[PDB]
């Protein structure tokens, strides 16, 4: 027994992020392919923050550059952005970035999700918070382990992107239990739903207010998915919103 929730791949997630930007201009709609992975999400975030610093200094971008965005529009986004939505594509089997990309490619050809999984890392620059959302709670590793990893990373970000008041990046592991209970392919949608809740209200623990019943929980997510798919219908194709 499973509520019907569409699988959201890199293309639909990106469309949703573009839509979210128009609602919350501080959100930069980072491209979802090639995706962040557990092997390079930290370095990816650092590169983006370094490029924001460069833009704020009126210096050239170092990259990497967006595929669906002009150079100038990307600079406009970096100037403005307060929040990085980093989507990490994960699979238990591959042991390197190269093998992860190969597995993703194979699964895409098959039109299958398999054991693959989307994680969300929110880098809130304005509030200086790192938020890790795993709809499966501990799929990659126990949350206490990810917390330690991200505490180390937070210290690094304090050096890469310092605050004048020397405020330190904080870390939050958002899910306190398995969220995606009884569902096999809803992780992309869950990440976007969590992201939307966070954009509306970064304090309220929306996850705690979910129905205990697995089906009702995912039928609510399906309602959210339906609302999003309608909203992104007419968004320009493979093209960032104009900042």
Author numbering: 159 to 401
Please give me the paper's original passages concerning this structure.
The chlamydial effector proteins ChlaDUB1 (CTL0247) and ChlaDUB2 (CTL0246), in the following termed Cdu1 and Cdu2, were demonstrated to have in vitro deubiquitinating and deneddylating activity. Sequence alignments clearly allocate Cdu1 into the family C48 of the CE clan of cysteine proteases. C. trachomatis Cdu1 is a 401 amino acid protein with a single-pass transmembrane domain located towards the N-terminus and a predicted flexible area up to residue 167. We further show that Cdu1 specifically deubiquitinates the major apoptosis regulator Mcl-1 at the surface of the inclusion.
In situ proteolysis and LCMS analysis identified a stable Cdu1 construct that displayed full proteolytic activity to pursue its structural characterization. Each monomer is composed of a central four-stranded β-sheet, which is surrounded by eight α-helixes resembling the architecture of the C48 proteases. The catalytic cysteine, Cys345, is located at the N-terminus of α-helix F, which is ‘sandwiched’ in between a set of three anti-parallel β-strands (1,2,3) and two extra α-helices, A and G, which are perpendicular to each other. A search for other related structures utilizing the program DALI indicated that Cdu1 (155-401) shares a high degree of structural similarity with Ulp1 despite the fact that they only share 17% sequence identity within a stretch of 221 amino acids. Remarkably, however, a small loop between β-strands 1 and 2 (shown in yellow) in Ulp1 contrasts with the much bigger α-helix D in Cdu1 in between the equivalent β-strands of both structures. In contrast to this difference, the residues within the active site are highly conserved, further supporting the notion that Cdu1 forms a complex with ubiquitin in a similar way as observed between SENP8 and Nedd8 or Ulp1 and SMT3, respectively. The additional α-helix D in Cdu1, a feature not observed in the other structures, however, may play a regulatory role in substrate binding or recognition. We speculate that this helix could act like a ‘lid’ that plays a role in substrate binding and/or recognition and assumes a different orientation when the substrate is bound.
